[PDB]
């Protein structure tokens, strides 16, 4: 009989008018757009700034989530960096079933971390698609992304099933708490 709250109300408690800018990144198919629509927090808008490169965005009050795929795509790395401007947090999403592409994801993740503009970011990892038989454990995704060895930044790896909205409250609550200090 008990019911979840709407993220709309959750965001009111968590951020409530505060200026927040998070970027949610990952390899294509990790589950990022799914997380966006599953939040139900406003319209998503897109800009395709090149014939290949493609960015999505959502804002609620003064919290903005900016979203793109990372990896392959020639190497459009400079076209991104504009979008890191005064970012508070990174959400990096991983397909926990895709054992093959995780080295790539760790590489990519590791490149975001080393970018100057990400020095002081809180880091949330969604180890997504945990519903799938034989996927990686959240620890195995932690290990692989090298989160043990980590700077002085606050980080957290969170199990998720994005298509059921599972894990999302937990990660976002961590993120919100972490960010207000
Ligand atoms: N089984 C499962 N499938 C998922 C999950 N999250 C996303 N997907 C599916 O993975 C595909 C890509 O998701 P999408 O959100 O477009 O990935 P994006 O490229 O990261 O934006 C879609 O078919 C989703 O339904 C999950 O947690 N479990
Ligand atoms: Mg997408």
UniProtKB/TrEMBL annotation:
It comes from the Eukaryota. Gene3D superfamilies: P-loop containing nucleotide triphosphate hydrolases. One of its GO terms (biological process) is vesicle-mediated transport. One of its GO terms (molecular function) is metal ion binding. Signal peptide: none annotated. Mg(2+) binds at residues 33, 50, 56. Keywords: ER-Golgi transport, GTP-binding, Lipoprotein, Magnesium, Metal-binding, Myristate, Nucleotide-binding, Transport. GTP binds at residues 26-33, 72, 128-131. InterPro entries: P-loop_NTPase (IPR027417), Small_GTP-bd (IPR005225), Small_GTPase_ARF (IPR024156), Small_GTPase_ARF/SAR (IPR006689). GDP binds at residues 29, 31-34, 128-129, 131-132, 162. Pfam families: Arf. One of its GO terms (cellular component) is cytoplasm. PANTHER family: ADP RIBOSYLATION FACTOR-RELATED (PTHR11711). NCBIfam families: small_GTP (TIGR00231). Belongs to the small GTPase superfamily. Arf family. This is Arf. It comes from Chlamydomonas reinhardtii (Chlamydomonas smithii). The lineage of its organism: Eukaryota, Viridiplantae, Chlorophyta, core chlorophytes, Chlorophyceae.
